[PDB]
Symmetry: D2
Subunit: 114 residues, 4 copies
């Protein structure tokens, strides 16, 4: 039900081998590790979770943008990019979290479909 896609606005390409960590907010308000991976050659990260595991809750998707830029020899502004949202059962079932990266900027959108 959850896919993360990362794009590079400098080279006009997927952002490949970018580390992505997903956390679920626990009852004590701390962020607990949920799922993680690295984006593929298409800039996409599939198979993070299952419908069964992805219960309603607040999730954080952290994208390691700083390591991405450093590997390209480019000095970036952000330590990482966060995307924090509520999964809701009465909305559509599938969530794509997309991020478009520049050294000093990023944009993020959610594409939520049934």
């Amino acid at each position: 039900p959850l896919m993360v896609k990362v794009l590079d606005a400098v080279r006009g390409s997927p952002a490949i081998n970018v580390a992505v960590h997903v956390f679920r907010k626990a009852a004590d308000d701390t962020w607990e590790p949920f799922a993680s991976g690295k984006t593929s050659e298409s800039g996409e990260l599939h198979g993070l979770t299952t419908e069964e595991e992805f219960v309603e809750g607040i999730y954080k998707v952290e994208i390691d943008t700083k390591s991405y830029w450093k590997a390209l020899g480019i000095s970036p502004f952000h330590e990482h990019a966060e995307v924090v949202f509520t999964a809701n059962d009465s909305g559509p079932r599938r969530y794509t979290i997309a991020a478009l990266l520049s050294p000093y900027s990023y944009s993020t959108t959610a594409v939520v479909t049934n």
Copy 2:
């Protein structure tokens, strides 16, 4: 070699049934019609052209954002969104032109891969 994808930042969804017109710049500097279609349920428009037809040149992709918003009962700022670029044979072969739409704003990126 060319795909157009349109997303709606208000509803967090593909932008469906959006008209898209592609033009190639002619030798006299006018824009000649090249290809067109409407985005599908996925917000994507495939099959606009073929490798054979898509020679190097300056192309314009016009996205009918105004009709999109009006159909949703929302008053938009832009008459349309243009994306104007050079197709180059010595870059990667496949071009995705993506646009993310808001009533008073849009962003566009190119994802160019081999």
Copy 3:
């Protein structure tokens, strides 16, 4: 009543010395040149027009993004960024057209206020 602001997303700075050409759609559907200038050290372009001159119409603000990236010796994707909109059709408004630039991407937004 019309201001254009351009930012550089690679450098995290104003985009300085960016050429901007404004056109207005004429009675015969052609784009007539309306005003032009370059962004300053703040990435802003002021003084393009006056409240008297800036009548109702369809305007195109062409931002010469290719010349900017290339004048910096970078090879960008877009020829330019065009922002096309109806203005002043419920009476005079003030418009800021903002653009944030990357070699293969740009974002634009409008801030519209009523004086």
Copy 4:
């Protein structure tokens, strides 16, 4: 030396009365509260800090986008928009953190200048 500016992409206006909380990473890796305020009628938040107070560190600027969309009675996707960055590590700089907001999307950029 720190300014936060927030714009509304749905209305084409400044995003007014947006709550912003700034944190600084402490020696024990926790986020310590640093400064907070709300955007004005121009969508700008000035006066958060001083050049003396704003030392080297890792800062998080949390923009309370959910409260903004909901205080307007809209149901948005994000809880907030967080912008996390190292500041002043080559000496004092001025930072503008800009955010452009839509119910299911936001963009952020930094403008960093050397006084």
